[PDB]
Amino acid sequence: SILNDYKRKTEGSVFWAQRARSVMPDDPHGLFISDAQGVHKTDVDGNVYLDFFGGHGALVLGHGHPRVNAAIAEALSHGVQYAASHPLEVRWAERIVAAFPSIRKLRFTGSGTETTLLALRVARAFTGRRMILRIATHYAKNTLLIRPDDIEGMREVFAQHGSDIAAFIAEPVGSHFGVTPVSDSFLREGAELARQYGALFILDEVISGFRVGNHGMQALLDVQPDLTCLAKASAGGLPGGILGGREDVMGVLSTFTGNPITAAAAIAAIDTILEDDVCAKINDLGQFAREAMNHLFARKGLNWLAYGRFSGFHLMPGLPPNTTDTGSITRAEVARPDVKMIAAMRMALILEGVDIGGRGSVFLSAQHEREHVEHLVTTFDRVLDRLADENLLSWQP
Amino acid sequence: SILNDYKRKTEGSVFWAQRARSVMPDDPHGLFISDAQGVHKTDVDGNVYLDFFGGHGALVLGHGHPRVNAAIAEALSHGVQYAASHPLEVRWAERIVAAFPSIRKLRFTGSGTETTLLALRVARAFTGRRMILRIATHYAKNTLLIRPDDIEGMREVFAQHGSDIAAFIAEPVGSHFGVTPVSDSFLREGAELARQYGALFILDEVISGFRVGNHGMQALLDVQPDLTCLAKASAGGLPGGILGGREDVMGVLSTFTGNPITAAAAIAAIDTILEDDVCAKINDLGQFAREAMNHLFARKGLNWLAYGRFSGFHLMPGLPPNTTDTGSITRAEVARPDVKMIAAMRMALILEGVDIGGRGSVFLSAQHEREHVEHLVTTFDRVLDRLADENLLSWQP
């Protein structure tokens, strides 16, 4: 079986998973990783994998890009781990202001989490209002919830509550870079409704920043958010966040200090992304990968769909591969894929030497090539056959 | 003047502060740091400072301890920046469970902020209750506030609201490691009130962990918190946090994955702290420093007080140095020190080659010695004379 093959391939991860279970809360064991470089990683058993998810978006340039690692090495040699005032942080900030037209002034934070938290406090401070509107992910007294793409629900929320809404906060593309898609038009209307009711619009660009393009998702949306949240690729793949925005709104900021090692990584990563035309190349690769996967599903006679935008894709078992409207995903109308099937899919991919994320998600990096995507297609072909072998596939759409 | 001497000593920091002001929200310029090692740091002008605050508590072992840096270097050479499953994270977790008797199971987080946030969500999940009790710092519909050491206010809060309180969360020693002191007895009573009303008790050990002793502040309090928050020294001085606690409460956990570089630093730092008896040595140094500073104030005829516990101290201008009850600080009865005086104090210390934190706070590390504390005393003697020179000191208690 897939499961027994997987356990036999990863006996060292089984060993470590047992030690982990004794000190952490509690289906099949996860993969313990010992090394990574480029677009490959190695587990504790010495198996090598082609990696399509390591970093969860934070590694736009792949594992250990030489320019980033050289900057980190030089910064480490000076011995400063934290500083509120450091030249590298200023140079990092200069890149962020230059990239995002809406970001006039910024503050560094310890994490993406602290950034969105700080953004809400700043919105409440600046407006004096108490309530925050956010988009529902699955379906907190000052939290209002709205389903993605539910324009009419959003209008009723503002009509009933708009004068008490400090801000509307939204992640573009969709939750977790598009697992639940949200339309650009829904974000633009929410920004307009926010302005008309005196609420701020906070755009969470923690994943989109320095991935979808050189000036953020907000440039693609033609929207000027009052506040922008950044981290991940905008921090060179290292820990830390950035809250940026309008001068007047950021003025309300007039324990985390600052991280010069992260700043060194961010300067090198941003310059490489700009110089090497990385966002365009991974956007093209993402479109190639979605088209190749949907052609594979069609070839095999399977009602699966590869969906998404930019340098990522996601899989929805149960929709036909020629599907163009992802509304049934956004509206949570598609049946949840069988959890045993998804687990076996992830295990079978690992048996073939490939790893992806979650229930079937992929990020592409600057170091992936079309040849790697073709290897993913060939591997998925075999994985689907093995799922069929174990009666884990359904064919009704 | 102090101010003009300071500007002349730090002209390179003036240069960088100008570039910083163009990209960040907006009294005197901060010190831009280029290098650090041991208990010293260097600014962009090449001035060297004896450092009593770098890391804000996170550097229990000083700047660039050789054992920690060797571990970080070895971990970096393998190229893995993030992993949910990595052997070093398991070994790090084994140290945390071994150190804290209350921590049976733990989850790693991206930051101290994410840890206290996650702790509140876990408390609400486990209890089903909506409200959180925390201690007031200066004097959020589900947030209840109580002043430090206000036992009677705490009882009334529980009488009026206790069945809806998911948790009482408190930082030991006091806000920012004792700037506003809170008594151990107040924490013990709050833990008892929490249990009796079905609320969880969350102890924020982000600063106390692996600083006050080898088994946390909770061992010194004889309290078994349901959840413990850790970061800073418990993460080897590197980014990341840890939420630990009771098996049943952590069971409610059954985007951050894990950081093997932080784990490498934490293993090395914890082992060094344990092996080298560091907590006892910096507790002794902290007591020495408070006594030496209060003797200095007495010698000079000044009504200033050095207060605090463990490896830190804080300064309260306006209280006599023989003061033993810090209740007037806890009750916010002491007048706020003049902001011009505090700024000049910090600048004058820098002119003498020393740096401290905030409005007069100090952390001591494993690499500080009594000789360094004596140099701080001698330097403060001169700084106080210069404050008097500029009519910045008041002598009424």
Side-chain angles (χ1 to χ4, degrees), chain A residues 1-140 142-397, chain B residues 1-140 142-397:
Chain A
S1 66
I2 293 169
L3 176 65
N4 284 339
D5 287 352
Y6 178 78
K7 293 177 177 182
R8 291 186 281 268
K9 182 175 186 171
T10 63
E11 280 186 9
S13 293
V14 173
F15 177 94
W16 280 103
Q18 285 188 1
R19 285 175 68 172
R21 286 188 202 110
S22 179
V23 298
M24 300 181 185
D26 269 327
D27 188 270
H29 66 276
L31 203 57
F32 281 77
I33 300 296
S34 70
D35 299 85
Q37 184 59 226
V39 295
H40 291 88
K41 58 189 181 169
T42 305
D43 67 11
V44 293
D45 289 274
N47 305 306
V48 179
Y49 304 94
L50 182 57
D51 184 7
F52 289 99
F53 206 73
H56 290 207
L59 299 178
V60 160
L61 295 180
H63 295 291
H65 188 279
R67 280 184 74 176
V68 180
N69 277 5
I72 289 166
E74 174 74 16
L76 287 169
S77 75
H78 286 97
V80 182
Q81 182 60 255
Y82 305 114
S85 303
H86 189 289
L88 289 174
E89 299 173 44
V90 175
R91 300 176 60 201
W92 177 19
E94 284 163 347
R95 281 153 176 82
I96 299 300
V97 179
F100 294 85
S102 67
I103 292 181
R104 323 289 248 99
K105 305 299 186 56
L106 62 80
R107 166 74 46 88
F108 290 118
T109 67
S111 60
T113 299
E114 190 190 348
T115 309
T116 53
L117 161 79
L118 182 58
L120 302 181
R121 291 183 192 175
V122 163
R124 292 184 161 108
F126 181 85
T127 61
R129 305 182 181 174
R130 277 164 303 182
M131 295 195 306
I132 294 293
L133 179 62
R134 61 176 162 92
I135 301 182
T137 50
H138 321 88
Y139 57 90
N142 284 287
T143 297
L144 297 169
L145 290 193
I146 192 232
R147 287 179 301 260
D149 288 3
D150 181 9
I151 289 281
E152 286 303 308
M154 196 163 58
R155 291 173 170 160
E156 185 67 9
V157 168
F158 273 90
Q160 302 270 306
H161 300 101
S163 288
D164 296 305
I165 295 173
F168 167 52
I169 180 169
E171 175 185 359
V173 184
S175 67
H176 297 116
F177 207 54
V179 172
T180 303
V182 73
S183 70
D184 292 354
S185 66
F186 177 79
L187 298 187
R188 275 185 293 256
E189 172 72 2
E192 301 163 13
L193 280 169
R195 169 166 66 84
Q196 298 179 359
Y197 275 85
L200 296 179
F201 178 53
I202 303 166
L203 193 63
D204 176 1
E205 291 228 42
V206 160
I207 302 176
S208 54
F210 281 101
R211 174 174 282 277
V212 302
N214 295 156
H215 305 287
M217 191 76 191
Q218 57 194 251
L220 306 173
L221 296 168
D222 191 42
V223 178
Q224 312 76 24
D226 302 296
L227 295 167
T228 299
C229 304
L230 304 164
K232 288 186 160 48
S234 302
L238 261 57
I242 322 171
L243 178 61
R246 285 171 45 194
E247 198 157 356
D248 297 336
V249 182
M250 296 291 295
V252 307
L253 292 182
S254 299
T255 187
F256 174 83
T257 51
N259 190 330
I261 313 303
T262 299
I267 293 162
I270 289 164
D271 287 356
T272 298
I273 290 171
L274 296 177
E275 287 160 24
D276 286 354
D277 202 26
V278 165
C279 295
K281 302 183 179 173
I282 61 179
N283 284 336
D284 185 78
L285 196 58
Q287 185 63 26
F288 176 79
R290 288 182 303 267
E291 297 181 356
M293 292 292 299
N294 284 325
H295 281 129
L296 166 71
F297 298 140
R299 278 203 301 285
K300 302 195 64 82
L302 293 175
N303 285 304
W304 286 35
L305 172 72
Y307 65 102
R309 299 164 66 189
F310 300 116
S311 48
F313 78 73
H314 312 284
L315 298 178
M316 186 51 64
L319 295 173
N322 59 1
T323 296
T324 41
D325 158 45
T326 51
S328 62
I329 305 174
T330 300
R331 296 186 296 265
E333 297 166 357
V334 183
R336 311 157 171 262
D338 179 74
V339 59
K340 192 180 188 184
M341 177 186 72
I342 296 296
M345 176 191 70
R346 296 282 318 276
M347 290 188 288
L349 286 161
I350 284 166
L351 292 167
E352 301 297 318
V354 173
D355 204 9
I356 68 180
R359 303 173 260 85
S361 290
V362 164
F363 282 103
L364 294 159
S365 81
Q367 297 196 56
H368 287 103
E369 305 290 343
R370 276 187 187 200
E371 287 73 18
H372 295 128
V373 170
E374 284 297 344
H375 294 179
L376 178 62
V377 167
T378 297
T379 287
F380 248 112
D381 192 339
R382 174 61 184 155
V383 164
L384 294 168
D385 286 350
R386 298 204 64 185
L387 294 179
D389 290 350
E390 302 197 1
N391 199 21
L392 292 171
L393 296 181
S394 304
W395 292 274
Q396 287 86 347
Chain B
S1 66
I2 293 169
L3 176 65
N4 284 339
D5 287 352
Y6 178 78
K7 293 177 177 182
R8 291 186 281 268
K9 182 175 186 171
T10 63
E11 280 186 9
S13 293
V14 173
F15 177 94
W16 280 103
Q18 285 188 1
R19 285 175 68 172
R21 286 188 202 110
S22 179
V23 298
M24 300 181 185
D26 269 327
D27 188 270
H29 66 276
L31 203 57
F32 281 77
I33 300 296
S34 70
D35 299 85
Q37 184 59 226
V39 295
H40 291 88
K41 58 189 181 169
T42 305
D43 67 11
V44 293
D45 289 274
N47 305 306
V48 179
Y49 304 94
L50 182 57
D51 184 7
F52 289 99
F53 206 73
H56 290 207
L59 299 178
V60 160
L61 295 180
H63 295 291
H65 188 279
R67 280 184 74 176
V68 180
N69 277 5
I72 289 166
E74 174 74 16
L76 287 169
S77 75
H78 286 97
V80 182
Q81 182 60 255
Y82 305 114
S85 303
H86 189 289
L88 289 174
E89 299 173 44
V90 175
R91 300 176 60 201
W92 177 19
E94 284 163 347
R95 281 153 176 82
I96 299 300
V97 179
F100 294 85
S102 67
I103 292 181
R104 323 289 248 99
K105 305 299 186 56
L106 62 80
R107 166 74 46 88
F108 290 118
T109 67
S111 60
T113 299
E114 190 191 348
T115 309
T116 53
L117 161 79
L118 182 58
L120 302 181
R121 291 183 192 175
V122 163
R124 292 184 161 108
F126 181 85
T127 61
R129 305 182 181 174
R130 277 164 303 182
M131 295 195 306
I132 294 293
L133 179 62
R134 61 176 162 92
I135 301 182
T137 50
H138 321 88
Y139 57 90
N142 284 287
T143 297
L144 297 169
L145 290 193
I146 192 232
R147 287 179 301 260
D149 288 3
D150 181 9
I151 289 281
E152 286 303 308
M154 196 163 58
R155 291 173 170 160
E156 185 67 9
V157 168
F158 273 90
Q160 302 270 306
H161 300 101
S163 288
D164 296 305
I165 295 173
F168 167 52
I169 180 169
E171 175 185 359
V173 184
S175 67
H176 297 116
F177 207 54
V179 172
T180 303
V182 73
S183 70
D184 292 354
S185 66
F186 177 79
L187 298 187
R188 275 185 293 256
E189 172 72 2
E192 301 163 13
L193 280 169
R195 169 166 66 84
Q196 298 179 359
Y197 275 85
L200 296 179
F201 178 53
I202 303 166
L203 193 63
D204 176 1
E205 291 228 42
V206 160
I207 302 176
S208 54
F210 281 101
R211 174 174 282 277
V212 302
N214 295 156
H215 305 287
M217 191 76 191
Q218 57 194 251
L220 306 173
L221 296 168
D222 191 42
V223 178
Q224 312 76 24
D226 302 296
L227 295 167
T228 299
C229 304
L230 304 164
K232 288 186 160 48
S234 302
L238 261 57
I242 322 171
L243 178 61
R246 285 171 45 194
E247 198 157 356
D248 297 336
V249 182
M250 296 291 295
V252 307
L253 292 182
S254 299
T255 187
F256 174 83
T257 51
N259 190 330
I261 313 303
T262 299
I267 293 162
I270 289 164
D271 287 356
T272 298
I273 290 171
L274 296 177
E275 287 160 24
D276 286 354
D277 202 26
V278 165
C279 295
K281 302 183 179 173
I282 61 179
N283 284 336
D284 185 78
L285 196 58
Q287 185 63 26
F288 176 79
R290 288 182 303 267
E291 297 181 356
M293 292 292 299
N294 284 325
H295 281 129
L296 166 71
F297 298 140
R299 278 203 301 285
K300 302 195 64 82
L302 293 175
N303 285 304
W304 286 35
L305 172 72
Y307 65 102
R309 299 164 66 189
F310 300 116
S311 48
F313 78 73
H314 312 284
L315 298 178
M316 186 51 64
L319 295 173
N322 59 1
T323 296
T324 41
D325 158 45
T326 51
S328 62
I329 305 174
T330 300
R331 296 186 296 265
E333 297 166 357
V334 183
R336 311 157 171 262
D338 179 74
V339 59
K340 192 180 188 184
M341 177 186 72
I342 296 296
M345 176 191 70
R346 296 282 318 276
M347 290 188 288
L349 286 161
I350 284 166
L351 292 167
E352 301 297 318
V354 173
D355 204 9
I356 68 180
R359 303 173 260 85
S361 290
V362 164
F363 282 103
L364 294 159
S365 81
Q367 297 196 56
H368 287 103
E369 305 290 343
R370 276 187 187 200
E371 287 73 18
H372 295 128
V373 170
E374 284 297 344
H375 294 179
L376 178 62
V377 167
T378 297
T379 287
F380 248 112
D381 192 339
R382 174 61 184 155
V383 164
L384 294 168
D385 286 350
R386 298 204 64 185
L387 294 179
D389 290 350
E390 302 197 1
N391 199 21
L392 292 171
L393 296 181
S394 304
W395 292 274
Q396 287 86 347

